Design a protein around this ligand. Sequence first.
Ligand code: NA
Ligand code: NA
Lengths: 335, 331
Amino acid sequence: GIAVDPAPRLAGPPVFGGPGNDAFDLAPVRSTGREMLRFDFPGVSIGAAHYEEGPTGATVIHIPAGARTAVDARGGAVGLSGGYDFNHAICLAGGAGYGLEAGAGVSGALLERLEYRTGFAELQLVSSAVIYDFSARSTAVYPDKALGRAALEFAVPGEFPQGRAGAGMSASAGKVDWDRTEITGQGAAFRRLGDVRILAVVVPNPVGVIVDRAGTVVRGNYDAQTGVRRHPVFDYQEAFAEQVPPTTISAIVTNVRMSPVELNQFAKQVHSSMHRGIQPFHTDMDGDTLFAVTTDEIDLPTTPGSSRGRLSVNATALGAIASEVMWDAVLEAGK
Amino acid sequence: DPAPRLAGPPVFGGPGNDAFDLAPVRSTGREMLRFDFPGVSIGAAHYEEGPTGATVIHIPAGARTAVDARGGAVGLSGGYDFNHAICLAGGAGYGLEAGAGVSGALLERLEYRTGFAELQLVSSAVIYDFSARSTAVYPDKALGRAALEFAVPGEFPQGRAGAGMSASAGKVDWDRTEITGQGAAFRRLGDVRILAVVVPNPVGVIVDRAGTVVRGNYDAQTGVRRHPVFDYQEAFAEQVPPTTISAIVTNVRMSPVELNQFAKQVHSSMHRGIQPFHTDMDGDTLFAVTTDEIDLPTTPGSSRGRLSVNATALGAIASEVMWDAVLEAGK
Ligand code: NA
Ligand code: NA
């Protein structure tokens, strides 16, 4: 039962005219956030680094073996690099399109680690996605190549820093009006069921708001005049009656083998499920992008039955389970 | 036809970026194409240490774009529906870093403003050009910066320049692969302008309008290039059992749907000059960009026929410009 803090964390208006990267002697800081999630998923490491001067950051999922990936991108503001069907790393970052550079830092560092071998089979593949986090701060500092390299260098197996850390440093939700927008964070959750492992990582910077399982809006669209958050649809319908009278970037990593077709449909399913915890979602203003990654370690049984039903153990069932892990990650990001 | 330019076998183990103090060179290629297209500038830079490079199309006002990507090896960043620059580079996925150099320099040029409407948008695509040389140097942030800084209006360096430094064609077998280059062509028709830029690094070969294979799949043992299908069909008979990155820039207003269909049409048309094309081995990516300056007429008629003036017509004409660019790249 994730205890979301009721207190507002309004982002506030930005002070314009703020300086960019070279105005600072930028030292990457290893992000520790509010709390560390510890999880057991050998082969998967997470590094998060930030620049205090932004504040902005990058979060890197490093899977050195490489892992089959599906990408599900939705909305009118996607900022994506690579989008590969096989990745050594996923890089999530602030700084809008400029922050795709962090992924290039990861790629270059991975190349150096491979002693500059460049065989087609040895290519180090990093997919990156970004949020626009400039309205939540004054500066134009963005995650650059050095910060992506640092996030890779800071990667620790089986740890994730919750909250304001890495790409989540200046993430925010609820953008009907910026006066009601609140800082979110990044979040992760992990479930092991038998030998099945599911890790969800999310950086919600939604137009919409974060909603818990009871239907309560818990982060975003905080009206300082009422002291409460309501669902954006109330503002939108009132807006229409008045004026028309008569990004979230995320990854799900699992160890269950899925074919490319199964993996892509799993990706769509889990990403759609996030319209439960984030509302609205998959909007034209959002660049929502989910990476579904399998480390291909265990097989589903060849037939889908169990005592819980004829069609109970398949990738759809995995997607339902993973959808709940992702909701938990979204709630950790908003907590 | 032309003298061979066999790439030769790569030597493994070569030095990468960290081994050099890498000095950008403004690419001049074998000759300069000159054209008149206000608001569009092209820069190209390379590292001799590769050799490898990046070519940047800069449209400072920003321009509506459609992206058509095909094949299994796509290496793309941004892929935006509106761009201030398109960055094409070698270095496989590592060369997407050049686009970040362009993006960061455009942000500095915008005095660090970051309003949503002021975001500087760069779409980048890459070719794998490591087999065609014996170093691991790749286009890095500094080189994309240099290509932008070198950009001028109305010039394009043909041949071994920018992203085309180590491009190559005809990959049924590496012993028959030949260096290509980058290429551009331009036409103006009334007020209509069409610019095609291409960096063919195809698995297939470059074919001219007569159907002659002109670059790629050159057999030193025979002195002759072959269409890959002749090798493929014999390979099957024997054993069973026993990337091109490109842009078309025009000034004609097209809706998003029209622009997208135009991109797909021009891109498919390139299977005339590059064969095979759009294969699983290729990461073929075409950007169709319009500066939205000229309206097509409301109705499509002319003395040349009832359905003669529309986007499909523009598509057909642009397809020819792109073929000419492909041939320049192979020359
Ligand atoms: Na694996
Ligand atoms: Na260097």
